[PDB]
Design a protein around this motif. Structure first.
Motif, PDB file in Angstrom:
ATOM      1  N   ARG A  44     -10.512  12.546 -21.177  1.00  0.00           N
ATOM      2  CA  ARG A  44     -11.112  12.404 -22.495  1.00  0.00           C
ATOM      3  C   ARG A  44     -12.561  12.011 -22.415  1.00  0.00           C
ATOM      4  O   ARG A  44     -13.237  11.931 -23.426  1.00  0.00           O
ATOM      5  CB  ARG A  44     -10.338  11.357 -23.288  1.00  0.00           C
ATOM      6  N   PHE A  61     -10.617  24.052 -20.584  1.00  0.00           N
ATOM      7  CA  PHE A  61     -10.019  24.008 -21.935  1.00  0.00           C
ATOM      8  C   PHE A  61      -9.308  25.313 -22.302  1.00  0.00           C
ATOM      9  O   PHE A  61      -8.568  25.392 -23.291  1.00  0.00           O
ATOM     10  CB  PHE A  61     -11.101  23.738 -22.970  1.00  0.00           C
ATOM     11  N   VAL A  73      -6.675  18.079 -18.455  1.00  0.00           N
ATOM     12  CA  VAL A  73      -7.086  18.587 -19.764  1.00  0.00           C
ATOM     13  C   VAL A  73      -5.946  19.128 -20.654  1.00  0.00           C
ATOM     14  O   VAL A  73      -5.870  18.783 -21.825  1.00  0.00           O
ATOM     15  CB  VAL A  73      -8.144  19.683 -19.617  1.00  0.00           C
ATOM     16  N   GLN A  74      -5.089  19.995 -20.119  1.00  0.00           N
ATOM     17  CA  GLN A  74      -4.147  20.749 -20.954  1.00  0.00           C
ATOM     18  C   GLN A  74      -2.686  20.279 -20.898  1.00  0.00           C
ATOM     19  O   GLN A  74      -1.943  20.465 -21.855  1.00  0.00           O
ATOM     20  CB  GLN A  74      -4.225  22.243 -20.583  1.00  0.00           C
ATOM     21  N   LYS A  75      -2.254  19.713 -19.774  1.00  0.00           N
ATOM     22  CA  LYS A  75      -0.855  19.323 -19.654  1.00  0.00           C
ATOM     23  C   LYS A  75      -0.723  17.878 -20.105  1.00  0.00           C
ATOM     24  O   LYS A  75      -0.175  17.615 -21.168  1.00  0.00           O
ATOM     25  CB  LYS A  75      -0.334  19.478 -18.214  1.00  0.00           C
ATOM     26  N   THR A  76      -1.301  16.951 -19.349  1.00  0.00           N
ATOM     27  CA  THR A  76      -1.134  15.530 -19.658  1.00  0.00           C
ATOM     28  C   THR A  76      -2.109  14.964 -20.690  1.00  0.00           C
ATOM     29  O   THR A  76      -1.800  13.982 -21.366  1.00  0.00           O
ATOM     30  CB  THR A  76      -1.254  14.687 -18.378  1.00  0.00           C
ATOM     31  N   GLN A  77      -3.257  15.617 -20.846  1.00  0.00           N
ATOM     32  CA  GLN A  77      -4.298  15.168 -21.774  1.00  0.00           C
ATOM     33  C   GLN A  77      -4.771  13.745 -21.512  1.00  0.00           C
ATOM     34  O   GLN A  77      -4.907  12.923 -22.420  1.00  0.00           O
ATOM     35  CB  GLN A  77      -3.850  15.303 -23.213  1.00  0.00           C
ATOM     36  N   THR A  78      -5.041  13.480 -20.244  1.00  0.00           N
ATOM     37  CA  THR A  78      -5.535  12.196 -19.826  1.00  0.00           C
ATOM     38  C   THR A  78      -7.025  12.275 -19.544  1.00  0.00           C
ATOM     39  O   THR A  78      -7.632  11.274 -19.208  1.00  0.00           O
ATOM     40  CB  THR A  78      -4.792  11.700 -18.586  1.00  0.00           C
TER      41      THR A  78
END
Length: 188
Positions: free
Chosen positions: A103, A29, A96-101
């Motif tokens: 969760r 994160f 986590v940080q680029k695509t946010q896939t």
């Protein structure tokens, strides 16, 4: 001197005996950690300048990203046990940080599956006591140094890298100064 306490590093008031030689802390994160891994390749460049016979250790931390933060620490424990750190590091950061896939734990798992670790192997690792104690280690090492920020590097349990005291005009020059400092601290 050219390397001064409080300048390129700080000294722990409470040195940690038996600590790993080179100990690095991160979180998926953590935005600077993303830089450190994907743009600066810090860990790699430190290793290239370390004397060898030198152990390099890297641990994940819980204090970012709540519930998923802890899932990520258990998953890093899985990566360490299976020796697959180098196949999952980049897709975890980007997930986590680029695509946010990423969760949920299930999405963390997908990254490993897509990196070719078998489901069965992953879930056995995930649930194993060897992974539990590996999680315990990561937390204990962080606790031992009163860790409240990442990225963080410690040398021999007594020195902490202080990147805020290094020039950032040039990323290359930043990394070398960083690695040279680790090497300096290493030979202290």
């Amino acid at each position: 001197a050219q390397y001064e306490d409080g300048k390129q590093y700080t000294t722990l008031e409470k040195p940690v005996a038996g600590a790993p030689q080179v100990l690095e802390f991160f979180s998926f994160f953590c935005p600077h950690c993303y830089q450190f891994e994907e743009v600066l390749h810090i860990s790699d460049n430190v290793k290239k300048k370390l004397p060898e016979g030198v152990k390099m250790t890297k641990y994940h931390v819980n204090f970012m990203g709540g519930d998923l933060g802890k899932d990520l620490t258990q998953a890093w424990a899985v990566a360490m046990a299976l020796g697959v750190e180098d196949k999952v590091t980049v897709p975890l950061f980007e997930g986590v940080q680029k695509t946010q896939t990423i969760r949920s734990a299930s999405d963390i798992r997908d990254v490993f599956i897509n990196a070719g670790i078998k489901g069965e192997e992953y879930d056995a690792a995930w649930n194993s006591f060897v992974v539990k104690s590996l999680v315990a280690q990561q937390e204990k090492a962080a606790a031992d140094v009163q860790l409240r920020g990442v990225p963080a590097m410690f040398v021999n349990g007594k020195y902490q890298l202080n990147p805020q005291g290094m020039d950032t005009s040039n990323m290359d020059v930043f990394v070398q100064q960083y690695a040279d400092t680790v090497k300096y601290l290493s030979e202290k």
